[PDB]
Amino acid sequence: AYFDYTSAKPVDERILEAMLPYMTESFGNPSSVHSYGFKAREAVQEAREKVAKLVNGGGGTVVFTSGATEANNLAIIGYAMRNARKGKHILVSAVEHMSVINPAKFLQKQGFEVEYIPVGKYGEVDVSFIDQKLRDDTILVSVQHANNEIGTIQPVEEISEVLAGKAALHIDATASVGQIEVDVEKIGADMLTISSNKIYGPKGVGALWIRKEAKLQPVILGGGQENGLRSGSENVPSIVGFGKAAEITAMEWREEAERLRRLRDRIIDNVLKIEESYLNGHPEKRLPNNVNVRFSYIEGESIVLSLDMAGIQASTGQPSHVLMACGLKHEEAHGTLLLTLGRYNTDEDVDRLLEVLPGVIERLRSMSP
Amino acid sequence: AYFDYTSAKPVDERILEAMLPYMTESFGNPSSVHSYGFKAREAVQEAREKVAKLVNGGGGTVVFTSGATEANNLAIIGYAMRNARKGKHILVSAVEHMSVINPAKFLQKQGFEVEYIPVGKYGEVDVSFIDQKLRDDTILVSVQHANNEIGTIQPVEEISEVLAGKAALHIDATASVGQIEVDVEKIGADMLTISSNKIYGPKGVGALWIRKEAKLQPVILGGGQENGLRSGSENVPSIVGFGKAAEITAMEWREEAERLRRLRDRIIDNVLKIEESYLNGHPEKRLPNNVNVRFSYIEGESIVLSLDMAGIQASTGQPSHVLMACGLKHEEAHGTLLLTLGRYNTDEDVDRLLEVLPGVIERLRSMSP
Numbered sequence: 095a096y097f098d099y100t101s102a103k104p105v106d107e108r109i110l111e112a113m114l115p116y117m118t119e120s121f122g123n124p125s126s127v128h129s130y131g132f133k134a135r136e137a138v139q140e141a142r143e144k145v146a147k148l149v150n151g152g153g154g155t156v157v158f159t160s161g162a163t164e165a166n167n168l169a170i171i172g173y174a175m176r177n178a179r180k181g182k183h184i185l186v187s188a189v190e191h192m193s194v195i196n197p198a199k200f201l202q203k204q205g206f207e208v209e210y211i212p213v214g215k216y217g218e219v220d221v222s223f224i225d226q227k228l229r230d231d232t233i234l235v236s237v238q239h240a241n242n243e244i245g246t247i248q249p250v251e252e253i254s255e256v257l258a259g260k261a262a263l264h265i266d267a268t269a270s271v272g273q274i275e276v277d278v279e280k281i282g283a284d285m286l287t288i289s290s291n292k293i294y295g296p297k298g299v300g301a302l303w304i305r306k307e308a309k310l311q312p313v314i315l316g317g318g319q320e321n322g323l324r325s326g327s328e329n330v331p332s333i334v335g336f337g338k339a340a341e342i343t344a345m346e347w348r349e350e351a352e353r354l355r356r357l358r359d360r361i362i363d364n365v366l367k368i369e370e371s372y373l374n375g376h377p378e379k380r381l382p383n384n385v386n387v388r389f390s391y392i393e394g395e396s397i398v399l400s401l402d403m404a405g406i407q408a409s410t411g412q413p414s415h416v417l418m419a420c421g422l423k424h425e426e427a428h429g430t431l432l433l434t435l436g437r438y439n440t441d442e443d444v445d446r447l448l449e450v451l452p453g454v455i456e457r458l459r460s461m462s463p
Numbered sequence: 464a465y466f467d468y469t470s471a472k473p474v475d476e477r478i479l480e481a482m483l484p485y486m487t488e489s490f491g492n493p494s495s496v497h498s499y500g501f502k503a504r505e506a507v508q509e510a511r512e513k514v515a516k517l518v519n520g521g522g523g524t525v526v527f528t529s530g531a532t533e534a535n536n537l538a539i540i541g542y543a544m545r546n547a548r549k550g551k552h553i554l555v556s557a558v559e560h561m562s563v564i565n566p567a568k569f570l571q572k573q574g575f576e577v578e579y580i581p582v583g584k585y586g587e588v589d590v591s592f593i594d595q596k597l598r599d600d601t602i603l604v605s606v607q608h609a610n611n612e613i614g615t616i617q618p619v620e621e622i623s624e625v626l627a628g629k630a631a632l633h634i635d636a637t638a639s640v641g642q643i644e645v646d647v648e649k650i651g652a653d654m655l656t657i658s659s660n661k662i663y664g665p666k667g668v669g670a671l672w673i674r675k676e677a678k679l680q681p682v683i684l685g686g687g688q689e690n691g692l693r694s695g696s697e698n699v700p701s702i703v704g705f706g707k708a709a710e711i712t713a714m715e716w717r718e719e720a721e722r723l724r725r726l727r728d729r730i731i732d733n734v735l736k737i738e739e740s741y742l743n744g745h746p747e748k749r750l751p752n753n754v755n756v757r758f759s760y761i762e763g764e765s766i767v768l769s770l771d772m773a774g775i776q777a778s779t780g781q782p783s784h785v786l787m788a789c790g791l792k793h794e795e796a797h798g799t800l801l802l803t804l805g806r807y808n809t810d811e812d813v814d815r816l817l818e819v820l821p822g823v824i825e826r827l828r829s830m831s832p
C-alpha cells in the first residue's frame with residue numbers, strides 16, 4: 095500500500111500511450127526543418143497549450159524544464175538576476191522547498207537581501223509580515239501555493255493583493271496543481287512552478303509559467319530553445335506526456351480531489367484516535383492528499399521502517415525545516431509520519447494502513463524509556 | 464530516408480523495454496526509505512555503472528543531467544566558478560557546440576579571460592596554440608572529441624599531454640561516444656560530456672563524467688541529489704534507459720561504426736562526383752556517420768527543402784560558427800548539406816539519396832544567376 099505520492103507518482107497509462115510514438119517512430123528534433131522536425135514542433139506546441147490551459151495561463155508563456163527543481167531555480171535566480179536593477183530585496187517563505195531556498199541562499203551570496211517570511215503554528219505564512227516588509231526595492235516574493243510536507247494551503251490571493259504592481263510573485267504550485275484550483279489569474283502569480291510527475295506525467299520534465307512582460311535571465315545556456323530562456327534539444331516525448339497529463343488533470347482533478355479527501359479524512363479521523371497523536375499543518379485549509387501526524391515518544395523513521403516491513407510505503411517528510419519553522423521541538427518533529435495519497439489509492443489501502451498502524455505505534459512506544 | 468541523426472535519434476526498442484517498468488510499476492523515488500525507494504536507488508546505481516564502464520570511467524564519477532547541454536554548462540561554469548582561485552584563464556575551441564560557447568561567454572561577463580582556440584581548414588584545433596597560450600593561471604581547456612557538424616576528430620590525446628597536471632581538460636564527447644573509441648584514460652579527460660539520445664537512449668537525460676578530485680560547483684540547486692552536484696528528484700526511467708543504451712553501445716558500437724562508415728563512404732564517393740562539390744571537415748580523421756558537403760551556386764536550405772519534398776531528411780548544420788571558423792566564406796557555408804547516419808539507415812536509404820540528390824543540385828543550379 096503506497097502512501098508516498100509526494101515523493102514519486104506512477105505515470106498514468108494514458109499518458110504513456112501518448113508518449114510512446116515520439117520515442118521511436120516520430121523522433122524528430124523540433125528545430126529541424128523537415129517533416130520529422132515539423133511534427134515534433136507541432137507536438138511540442140500542442141503540449142505547451144495543454145499545460146497553459148490547465149492553469150488558465152493565457153496571460154503568459156510556459157517554459158519547459160527538466161522538472162520543478164530547475165523551474166524553481168529559473169524563477170528565483172532567473173528573475174532576480176534579470177531584474178536586480180529595480181532592487182535586490184527578496185522575500186521567501188520559511189517553508190519553501192529546498193529548490194527555492196538554496197537558490198535564494200545562492201542569491202544572498204550574490205549580494206541580494208533575502209528575508210524569510212515566518213509562518214504560524216500550522217505553517218501559514220504571515221501576510222502582515224509581507225505587507226510590513228515590502229519595500230520599493232523588493233523585486234520578488236516566493237510563496238508556495240501549498241506545502242507538500244504538512245499540507246497547508248497558503249493565502250496566495252491575499253498576498254497577490256498586497257504585492258499588486260510592486261513585486262513579482264513566484265508561486266511554487268508543485269503540490270497544488272491537480273489537487274486544488276490553480277488559476278494564475280485568481281492567485282495573481284507572475285511565475286508558477288509546475289511538476290509533470292505530480293500530475294502523473296513523466297518524471298524529468300516540468301515548467302515555469304511566466305506572466306507576459308516578466309523578464310528572466312536564462313540559467314541553462316546553449317542553442318537558444320524555449321525562446322532563449324532554457325537551451326537544449328527538446329525532450330519531445332516527456333513534453334508530450336506532460337501535455338497529456340495536463341489535459342487529463344483538467345478534466346479529472348475535481349473528482350480525484352474529492353476521492354482523495356474521502357480517504358484522507360478516514361485516515362485522519364482514525365489515526366488521531368491513537369493516544370498522544372497530533373496533526374501537523376492546518377486541519378481544514380489543507381491539500382486533499384496529505385496526512386502529516388506525529389506521535390509522542392516515537393521516531394518517525396521507525397514508523398516508516400515498521401510500515402515498510404508490513405508492505406506500506408510512507409515518509410517522515412537535521413529535522414525538517416518546515417516543521418521547525420512551524421515551531422516544533424526537535425523531539426516533536428522526529429516523531430512525524432507523512433502519508434500522501436494518490437490516484438491509485440483504494441479504500442483497501444486505507445483499511446490496511448488503519449489495521450497496521452496502531453500496533454506499530456504500540457510496539458515502538460513499548461521501546462521508549 | 465532519415466539522414467539527420469545528429470539532430471535526434473530514435474530510442475532503441477531494447478532500451479524502451481528496459482525503461483517501461485520504472486514508469487508505472489516500479490516508480491519509486493531513490494531518496495525514499497522503503498522498498499520502492501530501494502529498488503529505484505538500485506536501478507540508478509546500476510545504470511550509473513553502465514555509463515561509467517562505457518567510457519572506462521572508473522577513475523571518476525558519473526553525474527546525471529537533463530542532457531548534454533546541461534552537462535556542458537555544468538562542466539564549464541561549474542568547474543570554472545569552483546576553481547577560480549587557481550586562475551581565471553580558460554581556453555575553448557572555436558568550433559565547440561553553443562552549449563559550451565555560451566557558458567564561456569557567460570564566464571567572460573563574470574571576469575574570466577576566455578581565449579578561443581583556432582582551427583585549421585578541416586576544423587582541427589591548433590595544438591601549438593594551446594601549448595603557446597597555456598599559462599599558470601589557465602584552469603580549464605574545452606575541446607570536443609569530434610565535431611558533429613563537419614565530422615572532424617580532434618587530437619584530444621595530444622592535447623592532454625600538453626595540459627598534463629596544469630589545466631583541466633573538458634571534452635564534449637556527445638558526437639563521439641558510440642562512433643569512435645572513447646576512453647577517458649586514453650584521451651586524458653578530466654570532465655566528459657555524454658548524451659543519452661546520441662546512443663539511442665531517451666532524450667532528456669545525459670551525463671557529465673568527472674575525474675576524481677576534480678571539484679565543481681553545482682548549477683542546479685535544491686535537494687542535494689547527485690552527491691550535491693545536481694539537485695532534483697531522479698528521473699529513474701530515463702536514467703535506466705541511458706544505462707541500457709550504454710551497455711548496448713559497449714557491445715555493438717564497433718560493428719555499427721563500420722556499417723556506418725560503409726554507408727558514409729558510398730555517399731561521399733558519389734556525391735563528390737557532382738561538379739563543384741566540396742567536402743567540409745577532415746576526409747579521413749572523421750566520424751563514421753558524418754557527410755558534410757557544399758555546392759557552388761546553391762543554398763543549403765533549398766537542398767534541404769528539395770530533399771524533404773522527396774522524403775529525405777537532412778540538415779544544413781547567421782552562418783555556422785564552425786564553418787566560419789574553418790575559414791569558409793559566407794557564400795560557401797550557405798551551400799552546405801549535412802547528412803548524418805545512424806543505426807537504422809540502410810543501403811536503400813543511400814540508394815535513394817544518391818538517386819535524388821544529383822537532380823536536386825541540377826535544378827537549384829538552373830536557378831542561379
Ligand SMILES: Cc1ncc(COP(=O)(O)O)c(CN)c1O
Pocket residue numbers: 317326327328469470530531532533560562610611635637638658
Ligand atoms: C556535439 C554536440 N554537443 C552537445 C549537443 C547538445 O545536445 P542537446 O541539445 O541534446 O542538449 C549537441 C547538439 N545535438 C551536439 O551535437
Ligand SMILES: Cc1ncc(COP(=O)(O)O)c(CN)c1O
Pocket residue numbers: 100101161162163164191193241242266268269289686695696697
Ligand atoms: C512542493 C515541492 N516543490 C518542488 C519539488 C521539487 O521537485 P523535483 O524533485 O521533482 O524536481 C518538490 C519535491 N517533490 C515539492 O514537493
Ligand SMILES: [Ca+2]
Pocket residue numbers: 259307
Ligand atoms: Ca510588472
Ligand SMILES: [Ca+2]
Pocket residue numbers: 628676
Ligand atoms: Ca589535478
Ligand SMILES: [Cl-]
Pocket residue numbers: 213214215216217218219
Ligand atoms: Cl499558521
Ligand SMILES: [Cl-]
Pocket residue numbers: 582583584585586587588
Ligand atoms: Cl584543420
